[PDB]
């Protein structure tokens, strides 16, 4: 057992109670609006804790040399995030009633960022490693930049309360995904000064507030009908 085992084990369980939650609930509303914020926001979390757990029984992880020594790279975020980054904002989306055009475009962006985000972690060169980094938080700040101007401006022309909901899981999605470029940097990936076992911490703590607190926001809400 790594030290960052018990972390991984711990995110593994509070997605479990969070995807099954969700699973419930969802499946005893009729409705059939509702049924899909359901499904999109239960399918979040199961993805999750399917690599969660892959990683606590050690997969999803590979040696990257790089600035001399042999660094631990544990790829199977990038498989996670990959797809479950996509869900949340197709969410936000459905809950603004976005143009299809800007979902593309979002879509298109998020797999930009966390595409070049895992090339950032394979790459050999040490600068390199920064310059994809880079790349993927342009791509990042994009996103965000249509969240809070383009999707509040949506927002405004909905009910109060399905404006009001928006907003928070807007505030929430701004304040969580801010803190992970910034994660990465510090961490194993990049200068390698918060260790691995911290890294995961943090990680865990952002996965988890963005999917099960995410989740748990919008499913409450009357806005989803
Ligand atoms: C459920 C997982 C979520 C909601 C994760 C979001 C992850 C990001 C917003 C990742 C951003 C990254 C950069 C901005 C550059 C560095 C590497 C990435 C993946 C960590």
Redesign the pocket.
Known sequence: GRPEWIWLALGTALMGLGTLYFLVKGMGVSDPDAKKFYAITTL?PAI?FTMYLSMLLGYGLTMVPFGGEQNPIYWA??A??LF??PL?LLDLALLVDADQGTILALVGADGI??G???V??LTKVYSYRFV??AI??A??LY?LYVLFFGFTSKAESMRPEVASTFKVLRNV?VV???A??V???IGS?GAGIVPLNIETLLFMV??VS??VG?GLILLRSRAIF
């Open positions: 979040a999750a975020r990038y996670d995030w479950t980054t949340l960022m966390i070049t985000g895992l950032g972690a994809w980094w993927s938080t791509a990042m996103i999605t969580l995904w801010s992970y470029p994660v990465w940097l990936e952002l996965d963005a999917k995410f």
